[PDB]
Symmetry: D2
């Protein structure tokens, strides 16, 4: 589960589109769109540690809960940029941020270029084909993947402490 080419959806296997990203690989750059329709680049090397969180949709229960959690857990932490990315259009994401006070993390949409396929989390089969799997990536300042967590079951939340602890050592 931690990292693989397949995940489960309600117990049924779902294959992901490659490539499978491994620790040590350069983090691909993803040109995503924020709620104000501006584009931003996640991935690559930055002067800060990056935490990229992918979710199927902010308009779904689990994803909503997860984003709220990371928004609270990463709050106040300096030296790190946290971005929750999904295929939701910026308009849905804007609505999400208006309904909930999200200010410790940035939500972004990958609808325009679908660059997250480069992270190996694009779902390749089933009802959710074309949507992103639930995963977490931590990128160091050298722009290398330092940590990967692919949640084995899409309907399940990730291990939050494993993520925070890795960010701390970086």
């Amino acid at each position: 589960g931690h990292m693989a080419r397949t995940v489960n959806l309600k117990g049924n296997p779902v294959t992901l589109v490659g490539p499978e990203l491994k620790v040590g690989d350069r983090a691909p750059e993803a040109v995503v769109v924020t709620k104000d329709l501006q584009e931003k680049i996640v991935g690559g090397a930055k002067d800060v540690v990056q935490v990229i969180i992918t979710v199927p949709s902010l308009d779904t229960p689990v994803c909503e809960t997860e984003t709220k959690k990371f928004n609270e857990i990463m709050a106040g932490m300096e030296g790190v940029d946290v971005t929750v990315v999904s295929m939701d259009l910026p308009f849905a994401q804007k609505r999400f941020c208006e309904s909930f006070n999200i200010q410790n993390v940035t939500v972004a949409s990958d609808f325009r270029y679908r660059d997250m396929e480069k992270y190996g989390v694009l779902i390749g089969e089933g009802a959710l084909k074309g949507i992103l799997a639930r995963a977490v990536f931590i990128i160091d300042k050298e722009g290398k993947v330092a940590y990967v967590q692919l949640v084995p079951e899409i309907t399940e939340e990730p291990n939050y402490d494993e993520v925070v602890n890795k960010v701390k050592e970086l």
Copy 2:
């Protein structure tokens, strides 16, 4: 009444991706996803008249107003299948239909294959690049485009009467 290769967004023109469709052309089939995540084909020939309405996003003011309008005016009509298509994910469209009781028309997402590019309504530049322009197509039972309407200004509502009158003739 006639398609074009550009539309305005607050007065400023934005180019559309081709091809430009014209009455008489075969209606391309678009494989879209409904709110229950089932795939549906719009376009092509069906034993019913098809009204395809494209909008930038149901999570925006005008599109919301437009969809509610068509839902009301198309209520009770037999022999016709009306579908509002956008790049919103099925999850957002699901939430839209739960907030406004939309039951006379169908809503579907073109996020998976982006087949509406085949209708010449995919926006190719500016802040809304990758989203669909506001338009209406009516397909006859033989699968041919019988009517087209491209709203000149994205922030404008379409001419509803013109659409209803043409559907009644088909």
Copy 3:
């Protein structure tokens, strides 16, 4: 035969992007581009039996051999429309036809819309990710998939006779 969600590339398994099609399913329409840059629609229901052959690239020995062989065995056959589809740009397909004198079958490119993903043959991993796997589909006049053959290994050629016999059976 039966379709599958995986194929081997030089012995190594690679997953395909869904959905997986089966005999009886409606054949999805694919808007492809011919060597003259015109668009052709394959799939759906037509008053003719359709044979859609997918290959990784006409610029590789195996695909060239497969295409020449199908061009030969389908020569002069009435009531059928055979199309070889790949992600090659039309410019490469044109050069191919010119060099191999392909006149009995049509070659077309899926580069513009990649509609063949709807047939479950888009490779989802490995060196050929984004390319089409080697397969054969036969669509009946009703627009239904009447036959399917997914070559288990990309470097291998398909079973030609099996296809020909089925086409004849469908008339």
Copy 4:
């Protein structure tokens, strides 16, 4: 060099997909595929000058002429990576390199992710919709666009000398 939102095909205008890149902008990264099927990253900041040359297809007369030409004037020039990019599959580019001794420039395909859309050269209408317009980009060591040249007539060769003179200044 000059950039625009349209190019002509035998004097007839064809619109390009946005965005328009300008000198001073950061050079977007494009994940392309070489003839050996390995992935290479063009754009972004590297320790060398980058010359990115986009063409409709190497399987066309003009494109072949231009490639051989650039492979001539950029010879022996150290500290500069030259890549010719197109939507041709790697297999055609491999065949191209085996037919013409090209050892001063690298050819790569953008078929997998179509990242060159980020450079504003993706054609959006007409018979060539989906392939790249003819252009030349020069990226400095800081990863910024330092030069841009969009050939006004896609069927013609670009202005070679001004490209080589600019790379020297860098």
